[PDB]
Paper text:
The three solved MetX structures include residues 15–70, 77–372 from MhMetX, 10–379 from MaMetX, and 7–372 from MtMetX. The catalytic domain comprises residues 15–181, 297–372 of MhMetX, residues 17–183, 304–379 of MaMetX and residues 17–181, 311–372 of MtMetX. For MtHTA and MhHTA, Ser157, Asp320, and His350 comprise the active site; MaHTA’s triad is comprised of Ser160, Asp327, His357. MtMetX and MsHTA both contain a small helical region (αL1′); MaHTA features a unique pair of short anti-parallel sheets (β1′, β2′). Temperature factors of the equivalent rings in MhMetX is B = 19 Å2, while both MtMetX and MaMetX are B = 21 Å2, values very similar to the HiHTA structure with B = 16 Å2. MaMetX shows a similar pattern with the top clusters appearing nearly overtop those of MtMetX with S = 26, S = 13 and S = 10. M. abscessus MetX was initially chosen for study due to its high similarity to the Mtb variant. However, the structure and CS data argue that it might make an excellent secondary target for drug development. Many compounds that inhibit MtMetX are also likely to affect MaMetX. M. abscessus is an emerging public-health threat, primarily implicated in pulmonary infections.
MetX (previously mis-annotated as MetA in the reference genome of M. tuberculosis) is an l-homoserine O-acetyltransferase, commonly also referred to as a homoserine transacetylase (HTA) and is a crucial enzyme in the biosynthesis of methionine and threonine. Here we report the structures of three homologous MetX enzymes from Mycobacterium tuberculosis (MtMetX), Mycolicibacterium abscessus (MaMetX), and Mycolicibacterium hassiacum (MhMetX) and compare them to previously solved structures of HTAs in order to begin development of selective inhibitors of MtMetX via a structure-based approach. Two copies of each monomer exist in the asymmetric unit of all three structures. MetX can be divided into two distinct structural domains, the catalytic domain, and the lid domain. The organization of the catalytic domains’ fold marks MetX as members of the α/β-hydrolase super-family.
Residue numbers in the entry:
A (entry chain B): 10 to 378
B (entry chain A): 10 to 379
Write the structure that this text describes.
Amino acid sequence: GAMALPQGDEIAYVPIGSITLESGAVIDDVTIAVQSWGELSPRRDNVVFVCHALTADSHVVGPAGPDHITGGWWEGIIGPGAAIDTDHWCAVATNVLGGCRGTTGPTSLARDGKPWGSRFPEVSVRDQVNADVAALAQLGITEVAAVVGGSMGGARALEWAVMHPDAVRAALVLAVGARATGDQIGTQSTQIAAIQTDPDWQGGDYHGSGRSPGKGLNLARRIAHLTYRGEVELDTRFGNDPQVGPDGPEDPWADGRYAVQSYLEHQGNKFVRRFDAGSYVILTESLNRHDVGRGRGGVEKALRGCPVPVVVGGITSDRLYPLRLQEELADLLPGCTGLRVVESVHGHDAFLIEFDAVSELVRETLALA
Amino acid sequence: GAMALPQGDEIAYVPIGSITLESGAVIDDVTIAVQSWGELSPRRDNVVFVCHALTADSHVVGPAGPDHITGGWWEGIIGPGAAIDTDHWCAVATNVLGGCRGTTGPTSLARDGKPWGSRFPEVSVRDQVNADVAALAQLGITEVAAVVGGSMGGARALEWAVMHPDAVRAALVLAVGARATGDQIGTQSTQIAAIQTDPDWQGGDYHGSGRSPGKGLNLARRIAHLTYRGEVELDTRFGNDPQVGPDGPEDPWADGRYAVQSYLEHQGNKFVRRFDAGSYVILTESLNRHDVGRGRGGVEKALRGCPVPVVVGGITSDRLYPLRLQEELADLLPGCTGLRVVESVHGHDAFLIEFDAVSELVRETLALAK
Ligand SMILES: [K+]
Ligand SMILES: [K+]
């Protein structure tokens, strides 16, 4: 019969067998890491599937621990009486295909007894969706009430709705576009270059070598983190202030740092301790090939042809997925009644920070379901 | 007698002696590279000083040629009948202190016969103004009719106007802010890190070693280039198209590149062949140190106290020095009657591309200097 759902901090590892990718290549022996909160209803029709973003994982809520290097990335969104109210809904989240937090990816051991590494194939967002759908099938779940996500999570949710409109009752698509843009591919390809030019990248087969491309991954994360924040907030929070230490300001003209510089350095250092460079490359490449129109006659035809009820949200200060992209989605999707604009200074990261606004968008989506 | 001004493509190398910087550090034996166009008046009062931006040089107009690895970066702005009309004005431009196109910088040889390299002291925008003023004095010039610049050049022009209001009759401050911002220091410090973490940076003393931090400088330039362009521009020009070469389209599902990726790579590759990594770091740190308010009671006090008439311009699509920064400049400077908005898809780089718009701003400025 079906595999049982885990609960809470517990990760279930769901084998889905060999999978055929959009490219026609095959990945053998794929395992999908899954977490869940709330009881699955008898008819298995109350699932809210949460698609995590580029550097997040299946741990949507909960504490950090030996199984969870980071705490929940959407704290308070899932729980009793929360937006995803676990008294009524069953929240489910996977780690994306190509990830490094339990699902098969570059750090995983392959059949030949060596890390996947450079042998891990290129994947698309559609491959990621179909791996999640396959995992749900192994859990006995053949439809979802809603699929929700922001950023790369929004790309997954959008493709899911377009690919499986008869198996989704509603979707939340937050802070993403219908396809990768020139600016996105520009910065993302530069981040990949920072990793791959690091001497310890070793062609991507550094796993188990004792060395890793930490300097390159650190730089890649710093590049990305700026794209995730708002321009004004960076100037009001940091401006050109020096870093303030316990007993006073540093001197940026000597050995000291600017406050924004110290902030970015700390973000980069923490990230390298928590994330795999090869996964970062695979997942960033999947974002570069995000395109809901591919094989479907273009973006307009694909979106106009999707009947799923959809809440589309965008953020005023988002510099990576600017509001014009969500205006396009909201216009073209016939199941979207109009763009929801999140007013926030926090840039793209507002979808993680603006608790009340995001809760309202999630509640609206589940009401549609 | 005062040193003679050069003309046209000719570079003059003006010694100004040893200089003490704002930090207290010293640079021995500073030499400033200078170019000039047009005749200096008998009163020596018709100089229009052009401040170049981060990766530009003294060669404001003219072709690439035997002595100029790049052609003029503001072609058509200087000449007979042009916006800087050499029938009336004497245009002068230096290579900035810390640069790598003729003026003393980290590639220059120090008194021990090795490049300054890691010994080159960090400079501020104010140091760069003081060095240009010192070079002008060696050329017999103690005042300028106008000082003009965009981007880093705008920071130099703004500081010059605030520092020497008695010796400037007008300024053009284009596509810059009153101080470095959080986002600017963020991206600039990351560009510096790309260079300094390169395995061949060697603390900045890579010269003559057989290894150089070209890969890191290439990455730094790609990061910067994105900040210089417009978001919509990049999506309309490249979108997610694959690169097309002589033999057809590349395939990003395998080893091929996207068109925007190939564009950035090519920009980086060309750049590393004609710019020095240590100079890039020094000049980028000078931008981190830009702050017209320092030692003057803050930005608002410094700007409100500047009596120079100023044309402030900003670009609608600029992502590095967004329009809100020029709105602040235009509001606080009493010599600005209102922001001039340049409509362009090209982002920050519009100040180099939008010739008609920039020509108009330069003409407006020089009319205020008369
Ligand atoms: K619609
Ligand atoms: K004013």
